[PDB]
Amino acid sequence: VYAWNRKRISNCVADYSVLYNFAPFFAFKCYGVSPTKLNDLCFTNVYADS
C-alpha cells in the first residue's frame, strides 16, 4: 500500500462490463459516476492504482 502500483490507461475503448470477470468482487464503489453508466462516457485518461 505504501508503494502502490499505478498504471495509465489511454487511447483505448474501455468496456467496464468485463471487470466482473477478472476479480471476485461484489460491487463497485463509484464516486461522482454510476457503475452502470461507465460504458456511455469518454474520459481523457484513466488511472488504475492497485
Partner: protein, 49 residues
Amino acid sequence: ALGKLQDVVNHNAQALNTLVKQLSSKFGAISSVLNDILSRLDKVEAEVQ
C-alpha cells in the same frame, strides 16, 4: 436626463440577467447541467441531484 426611466429598464434587465445566471449554480449537486447528471448517474442516484 431621464434617469428614472433608464433606472427602471436597468433594474428589469438586471433581474432577468441574474435569473439566467442562476442556472449555472450547482446548488449542492455534482453538476449544474441536467444532461450530465442524467448521463453519469442511474435514476435512483440522479433523482437526488
